mmCIF file of C-alpha atoms and ligand atoms in Angstrom:
data_model
loop_
_atom_site.group_PDB
_atom_site.id
_atom_site.type_symbol
_atom_site.label_atom_id
_atom_site.label_comp_id
_atom_site.label_asym_id
_atom_site.label_seq_id
_atom_site.Cartn_x
_atom_site.Cartn_y
_atom_site.Cartn_z
ATOM 1 C CA UNK P 1 120.088 82.964 101.675
ATOM 2 C CA UNK P 2 118.787 86.110 103.416
ATOM 3 C CA UNK P 3 115.480 87.415 104.752
ATOM 4 C CA UNK P 4 113.127 88.736 102.058
ATOM 5 C CA UNK P 5 111.612 91.167 104.552
ATOM 6 C CA UNK P 6 112.968 93.607 107.179
ATOM 7 C CA UNK P 7 111.099 94.951 110.205
ATOM 8 C CA UNK P 8 110.628 98.646 110.694
ATOM 9 C CA UNK G 1 113.588 102.122 120.025
ATOM 10 C CA UNK G 2 110.268 103.182 118.411
ATOM 11 C CA UNK G 3 109.003 100.777 115.753
ATOM 12 C CA UNK G 4 106.202 100.863 113.217
ATOM 13 C CA UNK G 5 105.237 97.211 113.695
ATOM 14 C CA UNK G 6 105.474 95.832 110.180
ATOM 15 C CA UNK G 7 108.055 94.379 107.779
ATOM 16 C CA UNK G 8 108.772 95.325 104.138
ATOM 17 C CA UNK G 9 110.071 93.370 101.162
ATOM 18 C CA UNK G 10 110.967 94.460 97.611
ATOM 19 C CA UNK G 11 112.937 97.353 96.146
ATOM 20 C CA UNK G 12 114.889 97.973 92.960
ATOM 21 C CA UNK G 13 117.532 95.173 92.782
ATOM 22 C CA UNK G 14 115.779 93.767 95.880
ATOM 23 C CA UNK G 15 114.840 90.207 96.657
ATOM 24 C CA UNK G 16 111.243 90.352 95.424
ATOM 25 C CA UNK G 17 107.925 89.941 97.276
ATOM 26 C CA UNK G 18 105.286 87.252 97.510
ATOM 27 C CA UNK G 19 102.413 89.518 96.440
ATOM 28 C CA UNK G 20 103.236 90.930 93.009
ATOM 29 C CA UNK G 21 106.435 89.062 92.127
ATOM 30 C CA UNK G 22 106.916 91.077 88.898
ATOM 31 C CA UNK G 23 106.784 94.393 90.821
ATOM 32 C CA UNK G 24 109.968 95.579 92.441
ATOM 33 C CA UNK G 25 107.982 98.019 94.654
ATOM 34 C CA UNK G 26 108.146 98.117 98.505
ATOM 35 C CA UNK G 27 105.480 95.865 100.063
ATOM 36 C CA UNK G 28 104.160 95.585 103.611
ATOM 37 C CA UNK G 29 104.826 91.927 104.341
ATOM 38 C CA UNK G 30 104.336 90.955 107.987
ATOM 39 C CA UNK G 31 102.249 93.076 110.370
ATOM 40 C CA UNK G 32 102.517 92.732 114.094
ATOM 41 C CA UNK G 33 99.118 91.810 115.677
ATOM 42 C CA UNK G 34 99.123 94.424 118.488
ATOM 43 C CA UNK G 35 101.389 97.021 117.004
ATOM 44 C CA UNK G 36 100.904 100.544 115.545
ATOM 45 C CA UNK G 37 99.950 99.379 112.022
ATOM 46 C CA UNK G 38 97.689 96.435 112.816
ATOM 47 C CA UNK G 39 94.336 98.080 112.227
ATOM 48 C CA UNK G 40 95.628 100.139 109.271
ATOM 49 C CA UNK G 41 98.078 98.307 106.958
ATOM 50 C CA UNK G 42 97.761 94.830 105.465
ATOM 51 C CA UNK G 43 100.133 92.296 103.849
ATOM 52 C CA UNK G 44 100.520 93.167 100.161
ATOM 53 C CA UNK G 45 100.141 96.905 100.689
ATOM 54 C CA UNK G 46 102.620 98.651 98.372
ATOM 55 C CA UNK G 47 104.256 101.762 99.928
ATOM 56 C CA UNK G 48 104.609 104.635 97.427
ATOM 57 C CA UNK G 49 105.441 107.485 99.796
ATOM 58 C CA UNK G 50 106.509 107.856 103.387
ATOM 59 C CA UNK G 51 106.792 111.267 105.050
ATOM 60 C CA UNK G 52 106.888 112.941 101.656
ATOM 61 C CA UNK G 53 109.742 110.765 100.350
ATOM 62 C CA UNK G 54 108.857 108.697 97.277
ATOM 63 C CA UNK G 55 109.174 104.924 97.629
ATOM 64 C CA UNK G 56 108.760 104.472 93.907
ATOM 65 C CA UNK G 57 111.955 103.040 92.332
ATOM 66 C CA UNK G 58 113.653 102.966 95.799
ATOM 67 C CA UNK G 59 116.197 100.347 96.905
ATOM 68 C CA UNK G 60 115.282 98.125 99.835
ATOM 69 C CA UNK G 61 118.198 99.349 101.938
ATOM 70 C CA UNK G 62 117.205 102.976 101.553
ATOM 71 C CA UNK G 63 113.528 102.272 102.267
ATOM 72 C CA UNK G 64 114.413 100.491 105.543
ATOM 73 C CA UNK G 65 116.792 103.162 106.574
ATOM 74 C CA UNK G 66 114.335 106.014 105.853
ATOM 75 C CA UNK G 67 111.565 104.260 107.778
ATOM 76 C CA UNK G 68 113.841 103.600 110.759
ATOM 77 C CA UNK G 69 115.035 107.193 110.716
ATOM 78 C CA UNK G 70 111.626 108.961 110.701
ATOM 79 C CA UNK G 71 110.322 111.040 113.682
ATOM 80 C CA UNK G 72 107.492 109.046 115.330
ATOM 81 C CA UNK G 73 104.404 109.841 113.249
ATOM 82 C CA UNK G 74 104.951 108.357 109.808
ATOM 83 C CA UNK G 75 102.540 109.335 107.062
ATOM 84 C CA UNK G 76 102.359 106.739 104.259
ATOM 85 C CA UNK G 77 100.677 106.632 100.899
ATOM 86 C CA UNK G 78 100.018 103.010 99.969
ATOM 87 C CA UNK G 79 98.328 101.310 97.051
ATOM 88 C CA UNK G 80 95.981 98.520 98.138
ATOM 89 C CA UNK G 81 94.659 95.754 95.879
ATOM 90 C CA UNK G 82 90.003 94.349 90.231
ATOM 91 C CA UNK G 83 91.445 96.517 91.595
ATOM 92 C CA UNK G 84 93.764 99.150 93.168
ATOM 93 C CA UNK G 85 93.227 101.971 95.653
ATOM 94 C CA UNK G 86 95.569 104.763 96.786
ATOM 95 C CA UNK G 87 95.228 105.438 100.554
ATOM 96 C CA UNK G 88 96.970 107.841 102.956
ATOM 97 C CA UNK G 89 97.708 106.358 106.390
ATOM 98 C CA UNK G 90 99.148 107.683 109.648
ATOM 99 C CA UNK G 91 101.139 105.272 111.786
ATOM 100 C CA UNK G 92 102.722 106.264 115.083
ATOM 101 C CA UNK G 93 105.925 104.577 116.154
ATOM 102 C CA UNK G 94 105.791 102.454 119.310
ATOM 103 C CA UNK G 95 108.423 102.035 122.040
ATOM 104 C CA UNK G 96 106.794 99.814 122.914
ATOM 105 C CA UNK G 97 104.965 96.484 122.478
ATOM 106 C CA UNK G 98 106.321 93.105 121.336
ATOM 107 C CA UNK G 99 109.079 90.814 120.211
ATOM 108 C CA UNK G 100 108.013 89.543 116.790
ATOM 109 C CA UNK G 101 106.645 86.082 116.301
ATOM 110 C CA UNK G 102 108.971 83.493 114.796
ATOM 111 C CA UNK G 103 108.452 82.004 111.224
ATOM 112 C CA UNK G 104 107.592 79.136 111.454
ATOM 113 C CA UNK G 105 106.794 78.716 115.139
ATOM 114 C CA UNK G 106 106.867 75.902 117.724
ATOM 115 C CA UNK G 107 109.889 73.981 116.476
ATOM 116 C CA UNK G 108 110.384 70.705 118.441
ATOM 117 C CA UNK G 109 112.037 67.304 118.434
ATOM 118 C CA UNK G 110 109.238 64.765 118.789
ATOM 119 C CA UNK G 111 111.187 61.491 118.364
ATOM 120 C CA UNK G 112 114.848 60.620 118.465
ATOM 121 C CA UNK G 113 117.335 57.861 118.056
ATOM 122 C CA UNK G 114 121.013 58.183 118.893
ATOM 123 C CA UNK G 115 121.657 59.412 115.297
ATOM 124 C CA UNK G 116 118.241 60.602 114.066
ATOM 125 C CA UNK G 117 115.567 63.182 114.928
ATOM 126 C CA UNK G 118 111.954 63.761 113.905
ATOM 127 C CA UNK G 119 111.343 67.492 114.229
ATOM 128 C CA UNK G 120 108.093 69.339 113.785
ATOM 129 C CA UNK G 121 106.965 72.945 113.526
ATOM 130 C CA UNK G 122 103.614 74.783 113.248
ATOM 131 C CA UNK G 123 102.680 75.222 109.569
ATOM 132 C CA UNK G 124 103.165 78.881 108.633
ATOM 133 C CA UNK G 125 99.942 80.090 106.957
ATOM 134 C CA UNK G 126 99.906 83.928 106.716
ATOM 135 C CA UNK G 127 102.179 83.969 103.651
ATOM 136 C CA UNK G 128 103.020 81.701 100.681
ATOM 137 C CA UNK G 129 105.670 79.114 101.633
ATOM 138 C CA UNK G 130 107.277 77.389 98.745
ATOM 139 C CA UNK G 131 109.537 75.196 100.932
ATOM 140 C CA UNK G 132 111.023 74.862 104.385
ATOM 141 C CA UNK G 133 114.784 74.791 104.654
ATOM 142 C CA UNK G 134 116.245 72.846 107.609
ATOM 143 C CA UNK G 135 119.806 73.316 108.724
ATOM 144 C CA UNK G 136 121.731 71.567 111.472
ATOM 145 C CA UNK G 137 125.284 71.964 112.691
ATOM 146 C CA UNK G 138 127.270 71.111 115.833
ATOM 147 C CA UNK G 139 126.687 73.888 118.412
ATOM 148 C CA UNK G 140 129.553 76.433 118.505
ATOM 149 C CA UNK G 141 131.978 73.720 117.378
ATOM 150 C CA UNK G 142 134.180 73.444 114.305
ATOM 151 C CA UNK G 143 131.690 71.787 111.998
ATOM 152 C CA UNK G 144 130.002 73.084 108.878
ATOM 153 C CA UNK G 145 126.219 73.526 108.758
ATOM 154 C CA UNK G 146 124.234 70.923 106.876
ATOM 155 C CA UNK G 147 120.940 71.561 105.211
ATOM 156 C CA UNK G 148 118.032 70.219 103.199
ATOM 157 C CA UNK G 149 114.475 71.225 102.301
ATOM 158 C CA UNK G 150 110.912 69.831 102.470
ATOM 159 C CA UNK G 151 107.854 71.026 100.532
ATOM 160 C CA UNK G 152 105.881 73.995 101.895
ATOM 161 C CA UNK G 153 103.029 71.589 102.576
ATOM 162 C CA UNK G 154 105.168 69.549 105.045
ATOM 163 C CA UNK G 155 105.522 70.308 108.762
ATOM 164 C CA UNK G 156 107.992 67.686 109.988
ATOM 165 C CA UNK G 157 111.369 66.492 108.681
ATOM 166 C CA UNK G 158 113.835 63.790 109.684
ATOM 167 C CA UNK G 159 117.436 64.636 110.412
ATOM 168 C CA UNK G 160 119.624 61.562 109.881
ATOM 169 C CA UNK G 161 123.275 60.505 110.182
ATOM 170 C CA UNK G 162 124.007 62.570 113.293
ATOM 171 C CA UNK G 163 126.925 61.701 115.588
ATOM 172 C CA UNK G 164 125.655 60.193 118.861
ATOM 173 C CA UNK G 165 125.671 62.306 122.054
ATOM 174 C CA UNK G 166 126.640 65.626 120.395
ATOM 175 C CA UNK G 167 124.928 69.077 120.705
ATOM 176 C CA UNK G 168 123.400 70.244 117.415
ATOM 177 C CA UNK G 169 121.797 73.555 116.506
ATOM 178 C CA UNK G 170 118.639 73.088 114.356
ATOM 179 C CA UNK G 171 117.156 75.970 112.364
ATOM 180 C CA UNK G 172 114.019 76.040 110.169
ATOM 181 C CA UNK G 173 113.457 78.689 107.533
ATOM 182 C CA UNK G 174 110.224 79.348 105.651
ATOM 183 C CA UNK G 175 111.153 80.165 102.024
ATOM 184 C CA UNK G 176 109.066 82.008 99.557
ATOM 185 C CA UNK G 177 111.822 81.721 96.974
ATOM 186 C CA UNK G 178 115.617 81.572 97.318
ATOM 187 C CA UNK G 179 115.233 83.875 100.324
ATOM 188 C CA UNK G 180 113.124 83.333 103.449
ATOM 189 C CA UNK G 181 110.693 85.086 105.790
ATOM 190 C CA UNK G 182 112.085 87.094 108.722
ATOM 191 C CA UNK G 183 112.471 85.420 112.142
ATOM 192 C CA UNK G 184 113.542 81.865 111.244
ATOM 193 C CA UNK G 185 113.321 79.469 114.207
ATOM 194 C CA UNK G 186 116.060 77.611 116.034
ATOM 195 C CA UNK G 187 116.528 75.058 118.796
ATOM 196 C CA UNK G 188 119.453 73.027 120.119
ATOM 197 C CA UNK G 189 119.504 69.325 120.974
ATOM 198 C CA UNK G 190 121.971 66.635 122.247
HETATM 199 MG MG1 MG H 201 113.117 58.808 114.246
#
């Protein structure tokens, strides 16, 4: 799996 | 490296969002407590424009890379949740302040046998958790990673059948769906 969200 | 202090999920062909699962839009997901956006954006805020560039029908990759690439003052138009409201917001990028919190937090071994561990973590509450995924593998050694899950309402799990006196890396992920929230948490243990 992967992260559903990414930080900006 | 200036940051805006929030995370986004969604996008066309993206991995969805826990707010409006049917809507592929770009959603503010996590917001950092002391960062640039904390008194201005909230979880579930859908971004429809940033610095004049439409975020309608955008892919997740492109949304992240536009946001990262912007000057320092980012002007957003968001739709906030009847009913809905369109809002313009100014957010100024920060050098600046914080490493982001981990999800979940406070992972620890609380009881152990030679071949078994009881681990616990703090229950993650800010966002819907459908399940926690726990993985464990021998630290930097030729060994695959093993994994299982517990319901989102559980905050401990037992790892069994370990080899005695080995170093294991233990990770816990908070899953909304197939995919998980950013900053999953890890410890190691002999
Ligand atoms: Mg035990």
